[PDB]
């Protein structure tokens, strides 16, 4: 199923059937909301935020616990990403591969991975533009 690779891995997370908060969970919904803001103010993305809440605070999931996505929770409190999680990580990886490439002008493997990374950016950038989350004038680097 992988693009740009022959791997057919199926590793992933399996959401539980129940869409109600665990009966064992006994902390207020709001106290999560301020807590989410606190890391996000510290600078953790919605991805890492969810990892910490579940790992240390028993938050199995942000929708089941409080009914809203952490982004929407953050968006409600005036916080959001500029460019999406997915695209944001691709740019830095493209940056890092490039920042490698000038010093090492014989990395023929690395340059190939750059094309794979760049083409992935273009597809992802194309679609975020279509949904209008990214205004049209945006172009990669």
């Amino acid at each position: 199923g992988r693009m740009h690779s022959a791997g057919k891995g199926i590793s992933s997370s399996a959401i539980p059937y129940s869409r109600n908060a665990p009966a064992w969970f006994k902390l207020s919904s709001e106290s999560v909301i301020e807590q989410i803001v606190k890391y996000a103010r510290k600078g953790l993305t919605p991805s890492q935020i969810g990892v910490l809440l579940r790992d240390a605070h028993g938050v199995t999931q942000a929708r089941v616990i409080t009914g809203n996505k952490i982004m929407r929770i953050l968006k409600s409190n005036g916080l959001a990403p500029e460019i999406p999680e997915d695209l944001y990580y691709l740019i830095k990886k493209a940056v890092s591969v490039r920042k490698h490439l000038e010093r090492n002008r014989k990395d023929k493997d690395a340059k190939f991975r750059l094309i794979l990374i760049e083409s992935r950016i273009h597809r992802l950038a194309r679609y975020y533009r279509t949904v209008a989350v990214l205004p049209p004038n945006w172009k990669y680097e």
Partner: peptide
């Protein structure tokens, strides 16, 4: 957590960066 934290992800963060940039 601190090593895992990023200075530049959130619209508020670059707003801080935009604030200090000018």
């Amino acid at each position: 957590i601190d090593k895992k934290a990023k200075k530049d992800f959130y619209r508020f963060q670059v707003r801080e960066r935009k604030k200090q940039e000018i």
